[PDB]
Design a protein around this ligand. Structure first.
Ligand code: 9F2
Length: 265
């Protein structure tokens, strides 16, 4: 019914689209490939900073972290500007959410500590939320590179939407920490052509994007209707049929999102 447009959209872009909007009191859950595994790509950075916040007192945001140019291995628009000074955990969080900074995410994982540079603690962190499905296995940028069907570094639209749900609308974080996670997503700079572009402007949209190879383009978001009702939208997509080199298509995420808005209005 709405499945007919999502599959319609998949045909248009030669894509696989996963969509999840958790049910509220007034609205029914929206499921499209909701429980199929998609790659996190950079979408993991939002629950990752929640992993850091949850584990640490606010005072920890001021911990200065140093690193070398050798640590800068992926898209890091902020971390490159700070090889000489380093960054505090807080700005690493800021960098990780608002600019999808990959090196900043890697150091936050290292701050999570432990095996695989913190990927097991981060997976462990998702389990604490009730997400038994997801796993992060590599750091940036290898986690964007797993071949299709490989279960490493994947989540599901269902799984991630519910994780975000407790992070932003629930009680996964104390209120003062919840406020920090929400504002970074709210002033994120990377999702203007994705979920945000499909909803009317008078809807509020906070989001964290993800992009990888095989045409992988994700956006996880929390949106508020003009009346102020919150919904969570998971939109995930890849274009594996085109190989490692498949171009990501943002139009797919904006088009799909509009469909969601049409049903949520
Ligand atoms: C909500 O995001 N919208 C954006 C966008 O990408 N802008 C970014 C955002 O939020 N930015 C911020 C900052 O971090 O505050 C800034 C400041 S960044 C900065 N601050 C310092 O104090 C410093 O010492 N050095 N630097 C580099 C300007 S735009 C960028 C945008 C860009 S053009 C346009 N019309 N919108």
């Amino acid at each position: 019914d709405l499945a007919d447009r999502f599959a319609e959209l998949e045909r248009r872009y030669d894509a696989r689209l996963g969509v999840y909007v958790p049910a509220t009191g007034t609205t029914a859950a929206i499921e499209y490939r909701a429980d199929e595994r998609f790659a996190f790509c950079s979408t993991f950075k939002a629950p990752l900073v929640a992993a850091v916040l949850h584990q640490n007192p606010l005072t920890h945001l001021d911990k200065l972290i140093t690193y070398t140019s050798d640590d800068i291995r992926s898209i890091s628009p902020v971390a490159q500007q700070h090889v000489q000074t380093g960054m505090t955990i807080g700005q690493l969080c800021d960098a990780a959410i608002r600019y999808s900074d990959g090196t900043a995410a890697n150091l936050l994982l290292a701050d999570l500590g432990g095996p695989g540079g913190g990927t097991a603690a981060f997976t462990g962190y998702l389990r604490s939320l009730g997400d038994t499905v997801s796993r992060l296995d590599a750091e940036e940028p290898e986690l964007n590179r797993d071949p299709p069907g490989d279960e490493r570094d994947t989540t599901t639209p269902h799984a991630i939407a519910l994780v975000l749900q407790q992070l932003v609308l629930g009680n996964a974080l104390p209120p003062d920490k919840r406020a920090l996670l929400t504002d970074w997503m709210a002033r994120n700079t990377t999702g203007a052509k994705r979920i945000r572009a499909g909803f009317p402007a008078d809807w509020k949209v906070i989001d964290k994007t993800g992009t990888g190879d095989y045409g992988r383009a994700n956006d996880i978001a929390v949106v508020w209707s003009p009346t102020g009702v919150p919904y969570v939208v998971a939109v995930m997509s890849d274009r594996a049929g085109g190989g490692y080199d498949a171009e990501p298509r943002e139009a797919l995420l904006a088009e799909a999102a509009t469909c969601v808005a049409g049903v949520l209005a």
